[PDB]
Design a binder for this molecule. Structure first.
Ligand SMILES: CC(C)(NC(=O)c1c(O)c2ccccc2n(OCc2cscn2)c1=O)C(=O)O
Ligand SMILES: [Zn+2]
Length: 340
């Protein structure tokens, strides 16, 4: 019905940031992710318990809030940027290394390296031409990046995020992923194995999250499939015959805007959509390797540990059988008439 709640009113009486007609319609109920300040101890407790929370005042990417297409085009440099195209609004991602195991499936969102000015050229053409094609720039930011953007990076609130890394016992910061998308772009539900600080910069993104214990309801692809860690369920046209427990899924929902930081806990499903008719969206992700597994295991196992266990079983069988395609039949032989 309404998970994000009523839209926030922007300062200076500039009206509603968004309205619900910019959100896509789905079949499952949702509830709000808490919007808190970083000074609120409840926000600290949520991150500690690995629950999602939107922090409204970290100033994490404060110097990046002036970023738009033309400022980035003149300052980001002339490196290569990964640009993904799609004939539809859903951008299904593929592990290209795993595309050898599954030949009978074809990709529908091809990557293309290009210069940043070529991406801005390619985008504005689509708007004048009026085409239905969509693009999504998704590029880890390196040091081939120009002077002013390095200075902007230096202006990030490293004090706040470094102590978050320390107090949680997390591993190191693995990468910063810059993301520029078109309105209506959708990133279908999937989970990551790293802790994520999701720093919104330009435009608005509706984030629908599912806790790890709803693994049964979301049906991820086989670990060896190129779409590993993504849900097989089409949120627009869910197949309740193949995926009956998707009728039981309950999400956590929020809309992040400029200055907001969404903590996506490790192994939490998330479905991200750039608001319809909301313009371009800009986001920077912060990935941290999770804290190492504790000394002695505490029982019962947390849900994300069972997910980790299930991933390792699928990997092990893939190596033991010499062919990832035999994992399925072996698993069915194991349970049919014995555990089901
Ligand atoms: C930012 C985005 C689009 N959300 C995401 O979740 C998301 C991606 O786009 C993505 C795109 C290309 C490659 C990897 C990606 N990963 O995972 C990291 C990974 C891949 S392989 C091992 N680890 C993502 O998580 C949003 O819309 O906000
Ligand atoms: Zn993700």
């Amino acid at each position: 019905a309404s998970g994000s709640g009523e839209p926030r009113e922007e300062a200076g009486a500039l009206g509603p940031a968004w309205d619900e007609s910019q959100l896509r319609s789905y079949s499952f109920p949702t509830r709000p992710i808490p919007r808190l300040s970083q000074s609120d101890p409840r926000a600290e407790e949520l991150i500690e318990n690995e629950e999602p929370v939107v922090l409204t005042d970290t100033n994490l990417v404060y110097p990046a809030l002036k970023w738009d297409l033309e400022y980035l085009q003149e300052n980001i440099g002339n490196g290569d940027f990964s640009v993904y195209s799609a004939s539809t609004h859903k951008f299904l991602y593929y592990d290209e290394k795993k595309m050898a195991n599954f030949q009978n499936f074809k990709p529908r969102s091809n990557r293309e390296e290009m210069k940043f000015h070529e991406f801005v050229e390619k985008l504005q053409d689509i708007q004048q031409r009026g085409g239905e094609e969509r693009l999504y720039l998704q590029q880890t930011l390196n040091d081939t990046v120009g002077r002013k953007i390095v200075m902007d990076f230096l202006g990030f609130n490293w004090n706040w995020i470094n102590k978050q890394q320390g107090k949680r016992g997390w591993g190191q910061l693995t990468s910063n992923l810059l993301l520029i998308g078109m309105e209506g772009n959708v990133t279908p539900a999937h989970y990551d194995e790293q802790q994520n600080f999701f720093a919104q910069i330009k435009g608005y993104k509706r984030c629908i999250l599912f806790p790890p214990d709803q693994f049964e309801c979301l049906y991820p692809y086989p670990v060896h499939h190129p779409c590993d860690r993504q849900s097989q369920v089409d949120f627009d046209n869910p197949d309740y015959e193949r995926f009956p427990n998707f009728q039981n899924v309950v999400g956590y929902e929020t809309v992040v805007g400029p200055g907001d930081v969404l903590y996506i806990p490790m192994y939490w499903w998330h479905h991200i959509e750039s608001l319809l008719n909301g313009g371009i969206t800009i986001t920077v992700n912060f990935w941290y390797k999770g804290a190492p597994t504790p000394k002695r295991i505490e029982y019962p196992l947390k849900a994300h540990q069972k997910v980790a266990i299930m991933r390792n079983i699928e990997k092990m069988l893939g190596e033991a059988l010499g062919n990832p395609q035999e994992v399925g039949p072996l698993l069915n032989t194991m349970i049919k008439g014995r555990y089901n």
